[PDB]
Amino acid sequence: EVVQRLTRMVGKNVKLYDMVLQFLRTLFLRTRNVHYCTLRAELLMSLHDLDVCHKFTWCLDACIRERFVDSKRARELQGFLDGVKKGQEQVLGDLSMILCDPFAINTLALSTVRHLQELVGQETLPLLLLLRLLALGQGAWDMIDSQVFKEPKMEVELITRFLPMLMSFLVDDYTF
């Protein structure tokens, strides 16, 4: 795990890093997503220890991992993603690394749940929660094909999706 990644990165150079990235991408493609979490974790560990858009992505991932329900880190990551120029496979790789991470997926789900709970408490249902959900969906759907931009927001469907949460909250309030 960590020891193996450190041993692999010990021979750290430009060519070594390029080869490691290519191998990680190939492994992620073969596993259909399984290797993405391992590649992201290895990249984050390398950046954290003797690290030297990759640095920004690693910092955002570290902030998300540290704060399961953190909001400032999420806002910073959203700003960084928005301020990313369209490019050939760069944004695709970033989104794939973000999405294909079971820890990352769990953190995104927890953040979405916290945002939904806060929205229910504030009674302001539709809004950074929508942007976060769109980013999560784009990250999840990036693995379908290469050279992908994003996925539809589905604002109309968002209200229908949130309707079950409102019904559950109303049921809980009536019971209490």
Binding site: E123, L125, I159, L166, M167, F169, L170, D173, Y174, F176
Partner: peptide, 22 residues
């Protein structure tokens, strides 16, 4: 304050269903 809490809960429940169309 139980009556006030119940009234607030009822109002919130009524308002929650108003956003279904929107």
């Amino acid at each position: 304050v139980i009556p006030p809490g119940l009234s607030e809960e009822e109002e919130a429940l009524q308002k929650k269903f108003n956003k279904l169309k929107k």
